[PDB]
Amino acid sequence: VLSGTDKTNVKGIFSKISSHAEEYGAETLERMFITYPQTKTYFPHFDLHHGSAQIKAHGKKVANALIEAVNHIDDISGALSKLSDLHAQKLRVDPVNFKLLGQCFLVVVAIHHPSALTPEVHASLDKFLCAVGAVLTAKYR
Amino acid sequence: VLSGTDKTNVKGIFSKISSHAEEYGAETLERMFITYPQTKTYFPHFDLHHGSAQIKAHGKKVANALIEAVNHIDDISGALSKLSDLHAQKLRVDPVNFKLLGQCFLVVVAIHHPSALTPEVHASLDKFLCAVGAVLTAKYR
Amino acid sequence: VQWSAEEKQLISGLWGKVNVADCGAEALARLLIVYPWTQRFFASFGNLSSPTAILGNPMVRAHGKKVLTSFGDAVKNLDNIKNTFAQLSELHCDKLHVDPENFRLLGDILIIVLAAHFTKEFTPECQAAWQKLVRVVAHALARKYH
Amino acid sequence: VQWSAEEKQLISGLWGKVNVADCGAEALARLLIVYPWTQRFFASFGNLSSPTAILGNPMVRAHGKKVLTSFGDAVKNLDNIKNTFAQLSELHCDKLHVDPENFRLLGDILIIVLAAHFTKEFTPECQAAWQKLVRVVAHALARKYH
Ligand code: HEM
Ligand code: HEM
Ligand code: HEM
Ligand code: HEM
């Protein structure tokens, strides 16, 4: 699980965002779509051109979900459980895709906050993203 | 999460496996070694020959630990906390390996109780083995 | 990959006894039931809404058989697997976009189906050879990703 | 694998700027901290007992430079990668038995380290080309398993 040091590490770097949910979420997805084009299959209905309004709107929701999880880090399930239905039951997102997006979020962090993404904070952030991924794919288990 | 039906399936199929626990553990292990020989690197102290006393004895323990998890199915993490420390912290077992062991255990159950390993029981057993794999690597998370 | 005489024997001996229609259908159904995200690729197939429905689905049953006939193409030409599976790689990779991790899961399910169908005849040596064949089939089928 | 002119330019462009020694040390050390099981392959390196120990470790630091140098060899011959890594595939596969999944976690870490070093210069197109690179490298490094 996440240690008290992990929870502290995550909240710290999320404060460092922190008014940057919209742009970081959007950047995360854009990176995901160009780096891993196979993930575009889940968004046939979006205009997938860079900077499209739908991606901006969607990235905002993705970031806010992550912030809500940082806020309720003691029970991540409790707070993002509604999303598993959507991702796993409705959308049938392949579990491999959660790592990809995680990867892109970490990159977006590294780009903007390179000194704050210390190996220890990177490890704690990894733990956090994987636990989020676990909650979203929970209807698979 | 394992549903109440998942738990009944698992509990049920382990009831048919109880009398042959020790034998089954050894067969799963043996299957892992020949099918996935790279797993042997974890056992440099063992005589890795089929039917050796160390494999037979280790196989009993592994099957007993699964039986114990089935006995505390409501809370697998509480009942296998000890083993996580051993597997993740002392041993550094690569997470990919747990799927290899789980696969072989499934081969073994299928071999001895084919009518019993229906697609649904298979589904629930898989879920169970995964959760157990998840506890034993929790120290990584 | 090289193939021993012993492996070649274990594969061909067992294959001649495989019920392609039944093992095929079963392995495809189990894939859909144990790993339900794989259901996304099979919307043309209709009702996959429960295990019963999945097991009753004729299109699942018929596709299941073709998938196993395909593994038999590998059996029939063991050194020529890469080329046998080339068009299928473009399809699964270029057209269908199936993560190769799913190739591995299907192969795992098929090994389990072979185990249930053969019981003690599915020896450890036999498993090791069959696991190997599916591993090389999945690798050939992922070729267009690389 | 096919490399477009733009990919080739993005790869060689960034590579000229990479601190092989520090980026190398950083990537390896991150691997061992983020994925603690990988420490098992490095028992010869001594104290891997804390993040600070790992970051402080001279053999970790030195091995990192040569792993990144070897990535540089890929950059330097993009069309001959499978040959360049053959002898290294045997070591990793036959001698060391490293699960290829970990080649993938190393690539991902390298991306993150390259992101941190290059900041906004690490554009989406750049992340995409470099990700492909580490993917092609992992695949060539795994070919002795197949
Ligand atoms: C753990 C990381 C993820 C988080 C935090 C997350 C979060 C969200 C949120 C907050 C929504 C909006 C829900 C709503 O409006 O009701 C959503 C929807 C959606 N998500 Fe994700 N998600 C994650 C991973 C993924 C991945 C990996 C994919 C596929 C590659 C994906 C695909 C989708 C799709 C297709 C929708 C529907 C969007 C729409 O039609 O507007 N998600 N997700
Ligand atoms: C979820 C599946 C697993 C279960 C239930 C399990 C259970 C156990 C148990 C009960 C022990 C004995 C602790 C003792 O000696 O008192 C043990 C030890 C050990 N396990 Fe596992 N284990 C699992 C997975 C694995 C895997 C995947 C590997 C590597 C492939 C592995 C390698 C070892 C080794 C090397 C030991 C120490 C053996 C010795 O020195 O006697 N285990 N495990
Ligand atoms: C692992 C070894 C596999 C083999 C040997 C195999 C074999 C085949 C064959 C022979 C076809 C016939 C082409 C067609 O009818 O269109 C096919 C099609 C197809 N495959 Fe696979 N397959 C494998 C894995 C998978 C997996 C894991 C998935 C997805 C989870 C998948 C998804 C599909 C789909 C959606 C079709 C087309 C169904 C249709 O609309 O007709 N395949 N495969
Ligand atoms: C995927 C990217 C990788 C590349 C490009 C790479 C490259 C190299 C190179 C150039 C060597 C030098 C051999 C020597 O001087 O002895 C080496 C050795 C080694 N590799 Fe990697 N490697 C990679 C991944 C990994 C991974 C993921 C692991 C395990 C987690 C690993 C474990 C080792 C070990 C234990 C050695 C020898 C250490 C020693 O005994 O000095 N490698 N690799």
Curated annotation (Swiss-Prot), chains A, B:
Cross-referenced PROSITE patterns: GLOBIN
Positions that bind heme b: H87
One Gene Ontology term, aspect cellular component: hemoglobin complex
Domain Globin: 1-141
GO biological process, one term: hydrogen peroxide catabolic process
Domain of life: Eukaryota
Residues that, per the record, bind O2: H58
Keywords: Heme, Iron, Metal-binding, Oxygen transport, Transport
Tissue: Red blood cells.
This protein's record includes keyword Coiled coil: no
GO molecular function, one term: iron ion binding
Similarity comment text for this entry: Belongs to the globin family.
Stated role: Involved in oxygen transport from the lung to the various peripheral tissues.
Assembly information from the UniProt record: Heterotetramer of two alpha chains and two beta chains.
Stated name of the protein: Hemoglobin subunit alpha-A
Organism: Struthio camelus (Common ostrich)
Curated annotation (Swiss-Prot), chains C, D:
Function: Involved in oxygen transport from the lung to the various peripheral tissues.
Tissue: Red blood cells.
GO MF annotations in UniProt: haptoglobin binding; heme binding; metal ion binding; organic acid binding; oxygen binding; oxygen carrier activity; peroxidase activity
Subunit structure: Heterotetramer of two alpha chains and two beta chains.
Keywords assigned: Heme, Iron, Metal-binding, Oxygen transport, Transport
Protein name: Hemoglobin subunit beta
Similarity comment: Belongs to the globin family.
Ranges of residues in domain Globin: 2-146
Cell membrane is among the record's keywords: no
Swiss-Prot/TrEMBL GO biological process terms: hydrogen peroxide catabolic process
UniProt: heme b binding residues: H63, H92
Pfam families: Globin
InterPro entries the UniProt entry points to: Globin, Globin-like_sf, Globin/Proto, Hemoglobin_b, Hemoglobin_oxygen_transport
Domain of life according to the entry: Eukaryota
Any Gene Ontology CC annotation: haptoglobin-hemoglobin complex
